[PDB]
Amino acid sequence: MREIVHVQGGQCGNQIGAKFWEVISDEHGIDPTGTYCGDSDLQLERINVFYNEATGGRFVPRAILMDLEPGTMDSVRAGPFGQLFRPDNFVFGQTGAGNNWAKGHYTEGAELIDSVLDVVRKEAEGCDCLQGFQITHSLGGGTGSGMGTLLISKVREEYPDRIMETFSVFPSPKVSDTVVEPYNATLSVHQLVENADEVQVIDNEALYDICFRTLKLTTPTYGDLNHLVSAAMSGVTCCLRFPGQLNSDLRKLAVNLIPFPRLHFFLIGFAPLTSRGSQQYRALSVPELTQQMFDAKNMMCASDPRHGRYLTASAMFRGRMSTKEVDEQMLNVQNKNSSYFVEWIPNNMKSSVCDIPPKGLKMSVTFVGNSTAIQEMFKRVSDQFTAMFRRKAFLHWYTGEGMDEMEFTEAESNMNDLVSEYQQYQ
Amino acid sequence: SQPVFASPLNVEKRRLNEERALMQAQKANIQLPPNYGDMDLILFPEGSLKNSNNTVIPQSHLKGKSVALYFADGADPKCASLLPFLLNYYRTMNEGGANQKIEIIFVSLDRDREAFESHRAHMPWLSIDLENPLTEILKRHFRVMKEYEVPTYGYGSRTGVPSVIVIGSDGREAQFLPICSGLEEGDRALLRWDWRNTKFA
Amino acid sequence: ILFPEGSLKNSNNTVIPQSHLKGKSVALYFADGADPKCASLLPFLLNYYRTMNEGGANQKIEIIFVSLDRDREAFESHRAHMPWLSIDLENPLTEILKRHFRVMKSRTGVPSVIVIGSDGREAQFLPICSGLEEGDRALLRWDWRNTKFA
Amino acid sequence: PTLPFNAQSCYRSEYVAKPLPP
Amino acid sequence: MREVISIHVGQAGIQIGNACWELFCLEHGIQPDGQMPDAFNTFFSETGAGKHVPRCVFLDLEPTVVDEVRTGTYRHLFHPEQLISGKEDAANNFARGHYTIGKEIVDLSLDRIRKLADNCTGLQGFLMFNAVGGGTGSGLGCLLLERLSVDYGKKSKLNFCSWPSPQVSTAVVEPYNSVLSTHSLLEHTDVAVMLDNEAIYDICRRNLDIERPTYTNLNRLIAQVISSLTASLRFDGALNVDVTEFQTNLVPYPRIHFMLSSYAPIISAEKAYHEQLSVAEITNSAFEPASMMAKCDPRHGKYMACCLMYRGDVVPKDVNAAVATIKTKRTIQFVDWCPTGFKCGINYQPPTVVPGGDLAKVMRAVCMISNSTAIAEVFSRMDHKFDLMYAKRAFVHWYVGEGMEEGEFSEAREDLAALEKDYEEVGI
Secondary structure (H helix, E strand, C coil): CCCEEEEEEHHHHHHHHHHHHHHHHHHHCECCCCCECCCCCCCCCCCCCCEEECCCCCEEECEEEEECCCCCHHHHHHCCCCCCCCCCCEEECCCCCCCCHHHHHCCCCHHHHHHHHHHHHHHHCCCCCCCEEEEEEECCCCCCCCHHHHHHHHHHHHCCCCEEEEEEECCCCCCCCCCCCHHHHHHHHHHHHHHCCEEEEECHHHHHHHHHHCCCCCCCCHHHHHHHHHHHHHHCCCCCCCCECCCCCHHHHHHHHCCCCCCCEEEEEEECCCCCCCHHHCCCCHHHHHHHHCCCCCCCCCCCCCCCCEEEEEEEEECCCCHHHHHHHHHHHHHHCHHHECCCCCCCEEEEEECCCCCCCCCEEEEEEEECCCHHHHHHHHHHHHHHHHCCCCCHHHHCCCCCHHHHHHHHHHHHHHHHHHHHCC | CCCCCCCHHHHHHHHHHHHHHHHHHHHCCCCCCCCCCCCCCCCCCCCCCECCCCCECCHHHHCCCEEEEEEECCCCHHHHHHHHHHHHHHHHHHHCCCCCCEEEEEEECCCCHHHHHHHHCCCCCEECCCCCCHHHHHHHHHCECCCCCCCCCCCCCCECCCEEEEECCCCCEEEECCCCCCCCCCCCHHHHCCCCCCCCC | CCCCCCCEECCCCCECCHHHHCCCEEEEEEECCCCHHHHHHHHHHHHHHHHHHHCCCCCCEEEEEEECCCCHHHHHHHHCCCCCEEECCCCCHHHHHHHHHCECCCCECCCEEEEECCCCCECCCCCCCCCCCCCCCHHHHCCCCCCCCC | CCCCCCCCCHHHHHCCCCCCCC | CCEEEEEEEHHHHHHHHHHHHHHHHHHHCCCCCCECCCHHHHCEEEECCCEEEECEEEEECCHHHHHHHHCCCCCCCCCHHHEEECCCCCCCCHHHHHHHHCHHHHHHHHHHHHHHHCCCCCEEEEEEEECCCCHHHHHHHHHHHHHHHHHCCCCCCEEEEEECCCCCCCCCCHHHHHHHHHHCCCCCCCEEEEEECHHHHHHHHHCCCCCCCCHHHHHHHHHHHHHHHCHHHHCCCCCCCCCCCHHHHHCCCCCCCEEEEEEECCCCCCCCCCCCCCHHHHHHHHCCCCCECCCCCHHHCCEEEEEEEEEECCCHHHHHHHHHHHHHCCCCCECCCCCCCEEEEECCCCCCCCCCCCCCCCCEEEEEEEEECCHHHHHHHHHHHHHHHHCCCCCCHHHHHHCCCCCHHHHHHHHHHHHHHHHHHHCC
16 A cells, blocks of 8 residues: 655654654554554554554554664663564664764765665565655754765655655754754755755744743653654644545645745644643634644744745644634635735645544644745854854864865855745745 | 444343244244344333332333433533523423423433432433433443443444433434534534424334 | 431430421531630620510521530530530530631631531621621621521 | 544444335 | 623722622622533633633733732633733833833733634623723723724723722822823723722711721622623613613713713612612612712712613513602703703613622612713812822822823823813803
């Protein structure tokens, strides 16, 4: 049938993925040992989309774990749902790309691609016909931003008639992890725009804002924050697994969102986001789901959407809700928030009604949107690159490992060009 | 085998009726096992129903009236909301004629005897006592449950408490009143009742 | 049932059941012998009792007295003032009610007449020693017409 | 590990065994 | 459904509101837990099945009283984001609320109203609750009421004010705060029910025979008036009147919209036992100089418009005869150009009652609202109290230092002078 291969690259990807497989497993009701209980045909009829039977009732996920240091791959092994993964699925580097894109890509990474492609195609050809891939990486680090974008380029040329969606974490406005930040991001954007179909942006600090305000949690760990991405990254792919009235797919929303091939960078929002205190005092309906999903303090990218106009936007509703109440409201918001959208697209919005609500919750929506509000975000990465290039700071750590100074000049030109189209289309 | 197969009323029904079917077939062209159409059962036994005067009435008293079961809990807020409107509907609809029109049976999802009697003091229609097994048998028959406690056999919850089910002579679900259902007409779904074509024959 | 079969005694120290109270307004009187305030409130209460029973053809009001005295020697000595019912100091019921209605020798203290409804359900505090502080005059605001034991 | 999910599709709900015309 | 929205600004309106929504919960039979064990749609929404949520907004710049509402009785029936709390109180300064510190709450408030007002059409009006004398009630009350006038130009909005009394003022800057209030609370609002506090002080001591009350008795008594005002929006009756045709009946010209109130009966269990409150005499007590709630004798003014919601069992016999009696009275003088003056309203629902409060259950009530010229000196009294203090610049530098300008104080002078000039112009 239809298969989605999961690849997890880098430290951030491997952490974020281990929480994702927890959300999928209990959405389908699978014991962490791998066996089945939960008693429903409709949660089970589409299980080959992520899992493979192994003759003891069990499911091993079609996930491959990759990293250039074995530190965080034992983290997922020892931690929750570590028994589920396949030991052959792990691929180790013993050295570690120390936040260096150069050794992520050219020098150090090249001798490990010969192994990671082995397992991926071994899982690929086992089925009838593959549908797509999904990759979790952060564009800050080395073993995700460079070591990941090479695996993007290799599997794309092997199987050009399939798709891929990458959940990517970028830099931040104020606080700044990984002081060689703009080098790894810009070098990865100009590769990611050339070899990948869809990219969901995530920022730590719109994501820090949400848990401070909405969830009302004072000291937020990695576990609870990844649980908030994993629900969204489960929500976008509900429709492949569960039936509904107005069905969707990755390719269904791939063609419906992007007008032109070079701009495919998407924002994510999720709703409802309710603290413990306000949980019993809300009467969850389709109206305020739309009002929650169009909120500047709700999106997971630290861009205020009020600067730009939304170009194309999709809504994967989830549960049993009536459908004029669906469609009439997207009409409402498009007419009411006339300045928020773009005039040269009639019916800016897109809808989908996936028939099974998340577990325990009753009425959920997951908002994906191609905005032009990433004018300010990529011009942020741009001037950070210019600030650290004229002084030529930290260039030696890259140049000494087969890098070229010509690559950085192309990278800025090839990313200032991406800014050009966002501003052009107002 | 309507509306479900795996219900205690239907297992008792099947056992009794084909016991009788085999006996008379041997004693005599008769189709075994008997069709669900051909089967006959007594739904409410001798001492089940008891009215507003605390007097037991037989099943034959319910002939000619649209009867409906009402699964209620004393402490459930939704049931506390639905009760006044069901009472008012009973009031007006039965007052407005020189003929009895509808009748309500009370089936208790309540916790205990005290609370059951306290809640039953408010209702002017018939009821089945909570210690009577017929309450649990009717719950499993019509697949109403507040929580997955009793196993269901690949089915789901038909509804939640509160619910009104217009019934027939043989345990047929004549129609479901959408109080808390796929439609959610809280307090308003009672007007959907087609009392003319669902008489307890 | 608020009171078991033996917590109530009349003026002649003979037990009466729960059922006898019905038809008429009933109040609990939290008090003690030693207190100047109880000494000052007792006679006003006596006159109120007398007039509210005299003016008409029914019994309208009835008082059950709960003691916070030190022991028995004070208990009979302050019970012999009273032509109404009282709860024995040696029954547990006194400590349960004490703790329940929150008089303490903490929000409220002696004296405190509080009218009692159907089942628990105190109707009004009778602001004799409260924020209102209607000394010997709060007594009049009793609503016997509204509350009748049943 | 889950206790069982008991919401049901609209198609399964309502296109059921109707009593037949003869 | 047809509805009305409630706004409480400052320490005055907040605990009035505490007394307000206590009754409405008891009127509809909903417990403080929030659940009961279409008539209420005009004041309460629905949350799932069986849970009802108030449709009000609270607004105050300090959390010292806002927190007190949240941790009180209504922890679960209210909503946490329904209450808006700032950081620093305006502290008896018109300039602190209207100019500097208020701006950070208006953007938060505007968002709330817009989210509450958009969903259902057929809204009817708004209900302010504030003290004129208090700073936040005057300051942040104004800019919110100013902003609502610009946005929903179409829409009715009632005001309820606690005007400073001729003796008791409880603040030194009451004359400054009030005259500044009404310049910017003449134009923006529609109708403003004037109330004084020492008026109700003599109410509690004479009819309700309590020799010293406090705030929880004041707010309990204003809650009965507003519940008798707006029951017609909630429940049915033989003849009911809403918000939108109060202003039709009572406001002849756009400036003259400051009016009094009175409520009969105001009688304890002392005397509800002892006499009828018959229609022939509850209206007589309504016109009595005692029962009015705005501390000015109507003998030295001319009545011009009156509105009388009888609530409870009144047969129309008694109405007509009682009306005719009032015209015959020579002590009550109407203005000659206004032959009719009375807009009767009879409801059928009995009067409501707090439990364990000083209000006795009565089988009929009258809530009389009266546009009269007796307001003329109440405006000139505060004008005189302004004239003393303005004479040498006292307490000006607080207002000036915050961001106001000297000179807008002057603009309020001819504004209030025009208001006193109008009443003496109209009432001849």
